[PDB]
Structures are given as C-alpha cells and as structure tokens.
C-alpha cells in the first residue's frame, strides 16, 4: 500500500507546478521579443 | 510647361495652377495669399487620399494621412542622428537665417544621399528630393518667395523623421529656446505658428482651435505657473498633458507603432480574429472587442450608452494587465 498510493501524492506537487505555471504564462517572458521602445511607455485609454 | 494646360482642370474654382522657376507646378489660392504645390505623383497620392475620408474622429485622421504620407516619401527611413548631421554640415544653426532654395536643395542632397546608400532598393535621390521639396514649401512657403526659416524646415524634418517622441521634442525645445534653455512667449509662439501651418495644408486646421496660437501659449503658460520662461521638462509634461494643437504627433506615434499590433481577440462587430492594428476594448460591457475597421465607421454594436467608455490597446496585451483591468469592470459593472 505504501508503495502504490504514496506513489500518486507526487500529482500534487505536479498540480503546483502547473497551477505555479499557469499564474505566470505572460510573466515568464515580458519582453518577449521585439522589443522596440524600451525606455519609455507607450499606452492610451482615451479616445481622441 | 505643356503638361499645364493639361492638368489644370484636375482641380477647378478658385485652385489657380502655376508653375516655378524650379519646374515644379503649384496652385494658388489668391485671396488667402497662400499657395500649394501638387506634384503628379503627389496628385496621385491626394487622389488616392480624398477616398479616404471615412475617418470618423479628428487626431485619427490627422495621424493616419501623416504615416501614410511619411511611409509614402520614404522619410521614415531617416534617423534623428543623419538629419542633423546634415543640418550641421551645411551650418545651418540660426534659426531667423533665410533660406534659399539652394541651400534647401543641398540639405536635402545630404539627406537622401545617406538615405539611399542604406535603401539602396527604396530610395532614389532625386524623386525624393522633389517630393520632400513639394511637401516642406508646400507647409512653410504659402508666398512663393522662395525664402523660408531653418527653424520651420528642422520643426518639419524632425517631426517627420524616425525619432524617440521626447528626442524630437527636446531638440525642437532646444531649437527655438535661448542658450540658457529658457523659453518665453514669443519662441514658443512661432512654433506653434509653425506646427499649425501644417494641418491648415490639408484641412484640419479648425478641429485643433483653428490658426489661432494664443489660447495654446496661453494653456502652456497657465500650466507654467505664470512663469515668464518655460522649461524643457515644464516643456514636456504640458506635451504630456496632451493639448488640442499637438496630440496629432503623438496619435502619429502611436498609430505608426500599432501598424504592426496583432492582438489575439475577436472583433466584436466583424467578427474578425485575430485583431491585427488597434484594438478597442469597452469599459463598461464584457466581452465586447472592436477592431479599427469597424469603429472608424462609427457602427456601433448593442448601441451606445449613457457613458460609453473605451480604452485602446496599441500593442499585444500583458494578461496580467488585461485581468486587473477585467477586474476594474466586473466592479464597475457590479455597482
């Protein structure tokens, strides 16, 4: 028993790991490539 | 020249088509005392203009016609740092100096020399020269007298040119403030003369607070504290502040960077997806997506409402960002 059920509780750090993953599926790369303008900010919310 | 009894009935009325002692044809508005070259292939670039007035908003248009114009004469291919090379070489420092079409002729040599050598396959010197010498007299030489300032034609290149926004800012503050970097009523007056010379070319003039540069000297100088002198940071965060007579350089800005925008959203009207340019995301709704195609028509999905709010994303999102900003709507929409 102790070596066929404890065998399954590593699925739990595997569901950390994915859930750790999934928080940060935009934060593991910002920059991401092209990284043009990269010392100021460029955004709008306003139309004009 | 022959070709002028030819194309003179391309435009009628009060339009009065004349030629230089340059060869290059230009109209003449008589009465106003202002005159405006039109070049074929910039006839066929207006021609290919005047179907596109579907633009719904002001800075929209403003913006667009300018990158399509800036792409369309090749100058965005020039860099801040070659075009004052170039103005330098040929000292042209005083910004009150006369200018000769000579001189013009050989900054604009220097120019396009170093512009082809780098686009080899896309610039050729003398269409180039032409054109750019069409579009600066057509903004700063409304007399025909074949004199413009340096201070005009340097706001104009660098402006048109491939440049950080605050580095074209900062050297124009540079150019028309003193050695000392203070700027008074006056300097900051004939820039803004100059800027506004250029919408009124094309017909936007009236939708930015006209011709008339005083309230916007006065906006600047009420944001300065009643101080006599301006200064390149007080400069910038007026800039900032966005005021009616100079967002139009920024909405250039910002369309040129989100000419090449892919958003993975679909367009709530159109259906289109992925969203490729702008997007435009409701602050109020949920799930409602619109891209430029459609908002540049004016139609509206779901109708509008009491306040209709919209924020436009110019870049492909950052999903943390867009969830906090999905969560400002859920409680927005909760209250």
């Given amino acids: 028993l102790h070596t066929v059920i404890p065998a399954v509780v590593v699925a739990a750090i595997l569901l950390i790991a994915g859930i750790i993953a999934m928080i940060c599926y935009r934060k593991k790369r910002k920059g991401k490539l092209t990284l043009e303008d990269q010392a100021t900010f460029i955004k709008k919310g306003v139309p004009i | ?335």
């Fill in chain 2, 1 to 335: 020249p022959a070709s002028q009894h030819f194309l003179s009935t391309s435009v009628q009325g009060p339009w009065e088509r004349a030629i230089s002692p340059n060869k290059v044809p230009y109209y003449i508005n008589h009465e106003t005392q202002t005159t405006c070259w039109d070049h074929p292939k910039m006839t066929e670039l207006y021609q290919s203009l005047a179907d596109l007035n579907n633009v719904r908003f002001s800075a929209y248009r403003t913006a667009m016609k300018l990158r399509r114009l800036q792409k369309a004469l090749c100058l965005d291919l020039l860099t801040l740092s070659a075009a004052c090379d170039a103005l330098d070489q040929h000292n042209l420092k005083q910004n009150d100096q006369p200018m000769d079409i000579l001189q013009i002729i050989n900054c604009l040599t220097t120019v396009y020399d170093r512009l082809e050598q780098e686009h080899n396959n896309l610039v050729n010197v003398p269409l180039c020269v032409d054109m750019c010498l069409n579009w600066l007299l057509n903004v700063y030489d409304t007399g025909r007298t074949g004199r413009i300032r340096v201070l005009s034609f340097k706001t104009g290149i660098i402006s048109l040119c491939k440049a950080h926004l605050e580095d074209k800012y900062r050297y124009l503050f540079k150019q028309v403030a003193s050695s000392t970097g203070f700027c008074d009523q006056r300097r900051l007056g004939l820039l803004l003369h100059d800027s506004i010379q250029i919408p009124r070319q094309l017909g936007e003039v009236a939708s930015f607070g006209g011709s008339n540069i005083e309230p916007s000297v006065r906006s600047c100088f009420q944001f300065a504290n009643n101080k006599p002198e301006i200064e390149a940071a007080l400069f910038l965060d007026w800039m900032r502040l966005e005021p009616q007579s100079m967002v139009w350089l920024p909405v250039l800005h910002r369309v040129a960077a989100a000419e090449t925008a892919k958003h993975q959203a679909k367009c709530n009207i159109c259906k289109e997806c992925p969203i490729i340019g702008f997007r435009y995301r409701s602050l109020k709704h949920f799930n409602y997506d619109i891209c430029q195609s459609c908002f540049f028509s004016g139609r509206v999905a779901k109708g509008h409402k009491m306040h209709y709010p919209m924020v436009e994303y110019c870049t492909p999102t950052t999903s943390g960002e867009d969830v906090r900003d999905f969560a400002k709507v859920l409680k927005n929409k909760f209250r």
